[PDB]
């Protein structure tokens, strides 16, 4: 369960990383319009 | 107790990211207009 709640943390930045990544390329859309 | 609250502090800090890169693109939308 260590390992569990570790891959669970791991799991969440690498989403957080994308997430803030499809903003961008989005705000960078939005402000190609 | 201890696991809860650790993984209180992760659900924490993936929605506070989720709210700050919401906002960002917010304000690109506001400045767009």
Same mark, same amino acid.
């Given at each position: 369960? &260590?390992?569990? &709640? ?5 799991? &969440? ?8 990544? @499809? ?5 960078? @859309?939005? @402000?190609?319009?």
């Amino acid at each position: 369960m &260590q390992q569990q &709640q570790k891959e669970a943390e791991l799991l &969440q930045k690498e989403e957080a990383n994308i997430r803030d990544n @499809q903003t961008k390329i989005i705000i960078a @859309q939005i @402000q190609s319009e």
